């Protein structure tokens, strides 16, 4: 297995077939998550994704976007309409 920075890695068939992608140049290897996904390693992807989901659960919109560095692209009215529907109808 060759990485994106020209480096070379010695693994066995067992370890290497855990990647459905591999199953060798890997020019694309939160960075972990991108790696699980690109290499199609199912458990690692589950494990990384559940970890990220935990960073979300129980948090408000503002904090979720605080932690992941996301900016609010809802106009005030849009955010009003969605929160109201969310709360009046779906909660």
């Amino acid at each position: 297995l060759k990485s994106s920075d020209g480096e070379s890695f010695e693994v066995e068939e067992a370890v290497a077939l855990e990647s459905q992608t591999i199953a060798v140049p890997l020019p694309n290897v939160f960075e972990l998550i991108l790696a699980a996904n690109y290499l199609n390693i199912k458990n690692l992807l589950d494990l990384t994704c559940q970890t990220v989901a935990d960073m979300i659960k129980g948090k408000t919109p503002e904090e979720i976007r605080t932690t992941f560095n996301i900016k609010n692209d809802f106009t005030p009215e849009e955010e009003e309409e969605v929160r109201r529907e969310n709360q009046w109808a779906f909660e």
Partner: protein
């Protein structure tokens, strides 16, 4: 911060409604990914939103839950025909949610047409819960049994079914084996016993079986031998000639059910046959002895065997002496409901008082949910309960006589309930009774900051009492009130509070038609519904109190299926 594939996968791990709603509001992108992978939708008020809105926002739903009539419908205070029709929901979904798996309805009107449409549109249909629904018959049950090849749950709890005939069950075909949970306890019509026995036998994943009274005690052992993997059993009838061979067949069959945790049914229960249930006792976590009119010592014999019990529903036949035993033996008890035998008799038929609830509060450190029907109460007993159980989350106390004061001091129960809301900081539900002035509500407004649900009957002096509640109760979602001297003033003074709540119900109070009109004018996002069976509210002076008013926020606007005795106040 990831490709769309990754976020969707992150979201699969988020199934709570509230967390899903928070993610939908982090940005337009998350809004989009989350709409499309949302599996379940909970609609606590079916008139709060239209089917079309739900279906277009959340196109891939496999599970929906809907609730119709408000709670006071259980107390017969919502006239027939009011609404809660699920048909439009199922029609909209019929063409959109081809892959739908679960429908859970509570207090809706469900008709045989609904059931046939469900059966025929949803091939992967697995779960039908009809909780306190009405409008359908065993014919509609027949359509589900014949057609839903994948069905895993048919749960009919407390529904009113038109009991045309018990033949519907024999429409499950012989190829059908997927049943996990069957609750036919509300059905009066006798099912074919051999059809039932053949169904239990061919269904290896059956985990919950709740029978009707028409399955007699002598047939129970036969079914149990066919389902030794059962975790919940609701018995049929529990009466028979007292015979060794009958008692021992039952004993062996039940003790062959090693996974049994929950027992219910017990209609017509004879004390001689209760012991068959004893081998199961030590692992039981739920016991529902509500239909069993056996006496206190008999209940005590059973309850001594139940160290793991977490939930008890009993009749007041338990008495205080029984509750004292419960408090000793059942250290893991989380929930106690004690129902009245003879509620239409004012003098006590049983020795069940405040002291039974006091014992339980002292002895059961995990007790957090109470429904208790008794005839007398004191402020002293309520204060002791609140001090012992600061962990209480649901406290529902019904003193049979309206407006009964503390029986030792003759004072209102303001102070005792004040102590409950003061000491139980995570109290999310309260219902009140006994003599109560505006002062209790002042305590409630001041302390009950976590309370989500409040039921009130025959209580308070003036609008200041309702005002305290609307003004102070930060987490309020449902307020239901009957027969209280609460009128126009608190309702209009606190109008915008009502947009933070699921609903407000008031019946037999002093809310005038004029107030109702005004509130409808002021608050167009509210449906303000006058429910009055005396004819047009116009034919009486504006100042005249309406029979009932039901108020609820909605994004759908005035509803399309009001009957002749219901008026919406929107302009």
């Amino acid at each position: 911060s990831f490709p769309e594939e990754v976020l969707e996968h992150v979201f699969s791990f988020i199934q709570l409604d509230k967390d899903r709603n928070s993610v939908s509001l982090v940005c337009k992108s998350w809004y989009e990914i989350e709409r499309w992978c949302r599996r379940k939708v909970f609609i606590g008020n079916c008139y709060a939103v239209s089917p079309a809105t739900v279906i277009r926002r959340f196109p891939k739903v496999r599970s929906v839950e809907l609730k119709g009539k408000p709670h006071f419908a259980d107390f017969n205070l919502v006239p027939d025909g009011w609404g809660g029709y699920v048909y439009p929901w199922i029609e909209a979904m019929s063409s959109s949610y081809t892959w739908l798996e679960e429908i859970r309805l509570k207090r809706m009107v469900v008709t045989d047409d609904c059931l046939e449409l469900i059966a025929k549109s949803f091939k992967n249909f697995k779960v039908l819960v009809l909780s306190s629904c009405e409008g359908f018959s065993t014919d509609g049950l027949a359509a589900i049994a014949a057609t839903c090849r994948n069905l895993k749950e048919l749960d009919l709890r407390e529904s009113d079914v038109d009991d045309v005939s018990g033949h519907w069950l024999s429409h499950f075909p012989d190829t059908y084996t997927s049943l996990v949970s069957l609750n036919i306890s509300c059905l009066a019509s006798e099912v074919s016993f051999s059809a039932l026995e053949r169904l239990v036998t061919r269904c290896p994943n059956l985990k919950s079986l709740k029978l009707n009274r028409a399955v007699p005690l002598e047939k129970l052992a036969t079914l149990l031998q066919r389902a030794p993997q059962l975790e919940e059993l609701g018995t049929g009838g529990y009466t028979a000639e007292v015979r060794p061979d009958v008692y021992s067949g039952l004993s062996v069959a039940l003790s062959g059910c090693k996974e049994l945790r929950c027992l219910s049914g017990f209609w017509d229960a004879v004390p001689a046959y209760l012991p068959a249930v004893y081998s199961v006792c030590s692992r039981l976590t739920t016991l529902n002895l509500s239909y069993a009119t056996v006496q206190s010592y008999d209940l005590v014999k059973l309850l001594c065997q139940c160290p793991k019990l977490q939930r008890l529903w009993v009749l007041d036949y338990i008495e205080d002496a029984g509750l004292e035993v419960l408090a000793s033996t059942c250290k893991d008890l989380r929930e106690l409901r004690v129902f009245p035998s003879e509620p239409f008799v004012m003098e006590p038929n049983v020795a069940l008082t405040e002291q039974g609830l006091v014992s339980v509060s002292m002895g059961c450190p995990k007790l957090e949910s109470v429904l208790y029907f008794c005839r007398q109460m004191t402020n002293a007993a309520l204060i002791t309960i609140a001090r012992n159980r600061p962990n209480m989350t649901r406290f529902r106390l019904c003193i049979i006589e309206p407006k009964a004061p503390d029986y030792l001091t003759l004072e209102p129960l303001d102070i005792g309930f004040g102590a409950i809301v003061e000491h139980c900081k995570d109290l999310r539900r309260l219902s009140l009774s006994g003599l109560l002035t505006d002062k209790v509500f002042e305590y409630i407004g001041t302390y009950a900051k976590k309370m989500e649900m409040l039921s009130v009957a025959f209580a308070g002096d003036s609008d200041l009492g309702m005002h305290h509640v609307l003004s102070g109760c930060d987490s309020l979602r449902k307020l239901e009130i009957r027969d209280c001297p609460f009128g126009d003033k608190a309702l209009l003074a606190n109008a915008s509070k009502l947009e933070t709540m699921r609903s407000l119900w008031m019946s037999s109070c002093s809310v005038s038609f004029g107030a109702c009109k005004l509130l409808g004018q002021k608050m167009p996002k509210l449906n303000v519904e006058v429910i009055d069976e005396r004819g047009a509210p116009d034919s009486r002076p504006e100042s005249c109190p309406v029979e009932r008013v039901f108020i609820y926020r909605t994004v759908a606007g005035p509803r399309f299926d009001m009957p002749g005795f219901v008026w919406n106040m929107d302009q």
